[PDB]
Amino acid sequence: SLPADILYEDQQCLVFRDVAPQAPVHFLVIPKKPIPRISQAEEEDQQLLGHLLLVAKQTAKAEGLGDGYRLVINDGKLGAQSVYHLHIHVLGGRQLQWPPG
């Protein structure tokens, strides 16, 4: 991964490309605060969590996902969570299927 694979950063979060992409466009939004799982977020995280979704949405627009995309958050083993730090997946650039896994 190269520094340009960081698509966006601010005081609250980072956005970077997934090096194992499951779609033509596939990136990751994380908080700088190490919330390990969404099930362990608390009430104080409310603004931060809202901020992550807006950043996901803005980055999707900036990456050309105007025809549609999917946001995914995985929790625990059953969610297939692969790293114990909160990630929002953004996938686009192809037809997403249903069910979502």
Add this chain to the structure above:
Amino acid sequence: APTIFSRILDKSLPADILYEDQQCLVFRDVAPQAPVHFLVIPKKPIPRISQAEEEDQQLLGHLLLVAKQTAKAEGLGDGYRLVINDGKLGAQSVYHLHIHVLGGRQLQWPPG
């Protein structure tokens, strides 16, 4: 009224409601793709996530916290998945913003 979710919100169409407050409503999906599958929707009728604005930041965070609390109450302690579909390629079909919460079975990868 933009979608059938307007009928669930105004209670003219009876749904299996799990949680409600002034900013949102939670109910079971009528075509579940997992043993537990419910939807978290705002009462404010944002049609899709791509059309949310910065003024919606507090509401969005609230929807996620409500998803996580309801997951806990539904017994999804071994894990689950949260999904938001936008537009045609996202496979969105009801044009009222909502978070899918799926649990009770191993979810696969990729996520569709």
